[PDB]
Amino acid sequence: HHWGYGKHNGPEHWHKDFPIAKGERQSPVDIDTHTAKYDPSLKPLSVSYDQATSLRILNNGHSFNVEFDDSQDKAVLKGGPLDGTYRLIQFHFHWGSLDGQGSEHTVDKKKYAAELHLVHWNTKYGDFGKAVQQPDGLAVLGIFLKVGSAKPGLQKVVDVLDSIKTKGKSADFTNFDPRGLLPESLDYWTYPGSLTTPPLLECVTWIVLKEPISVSSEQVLKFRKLNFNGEGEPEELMVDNWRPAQPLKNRQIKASFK
Ligand SMILES: [Zn+2]
């Protein structure tokens, strides 16, 4: 039926509707710390989220994402392994039924409690729609969440979730500065991949940060109260909305740090 994260419509069934699920540059992957190659040519990430314009927060039945106004070159990402400018369009998360799982990428098979994705599209393509048709159309910044002390910047997100519990619910979410979601260090691993949810197009350059951000179990707990279902339907908890590691195939993961 329609895709989901369930046993009958989840990850292992996607290939029937999206044959590319069995492609050559599918994401996510496991990051083996000693087959990853340090590449000294990799420049540092250049982030300019100081003029980001959040618009709203929405539960789409798969996750919840915050939309931004990507009309101007306000919040852009560049540097790193990228050529050109990428515009921030939205961010969302993946989490699990328990703290010990939830991230999509793993480091040496280690899973994190969650994973945040800041999605950006290559401006030379004119728009998000055309960009996803290109192998270099999107740049996704991936950030791991570990349970520890609270992240002050995630507090505003965690608090509004209550009012968008079921699929279809939206809320004006203005003035949220995504800079409070970033770790101290910008060291990263990078590899060519895909979108982790259908259509699973292989149009993404992945940038996964080495340093995870800490969030309190209190904060993580709130993600688990969202529902996959719409209002007035069989209540099914939004948990374990993550896709498992895919074969790395002929790819090499590069590290910006020795
Ligand atoms: Zn994602």
Swiss-Prot record:
Origin: domain of life: Eukaryota
Outcome when changing residue 199 to A: Normal CO(2) hydrase activity, but impaired stability
Cellular localization per UniProt: Cytoplasm; Cell membrane
Phenotype upon changing residue 104 to D: Normal CO(2) hydrase activity
Effect of residue 196 to D/E: Strongly reduced activity, but enhanced zinc affinity
One Pfam short name: Carb_anhydrase
Cofactor comment: Zinc. Can also use cobalt(II) with lower efficiency, but not copper(II), nickel(II) and manganese(II).
Keyword Cytoplasm recorded: yes
Catalysis performed (reactions): hydrogencarbonate + H(+) = CO2 + H2O; urea = cyanamide + H2O
Alpha-carbonic anhydrase domain span: 1-257
Involvement in disease: Osteopetrosis, autosomal recessive 3: A rare genetic disease characterized by abnormally dense bone, due to defective resorption of immature bone. Osteopetrosis occurs in two forms: a severe autosomal recessive form occurring in utero, infancy, or childhood, and a benign autosomal dominant form occurring in adolescence or adulthood. Recessive osteopetrosis commonly manifests in early infancy with macrocephaly, feeding difficulties, evolving blindness and deafness, bone marrow failure, severe anemia, and hepatosplenomegaly.
The protein's name: Carbonic anhydrase 2
Source organism of the structure: Homo sapiens
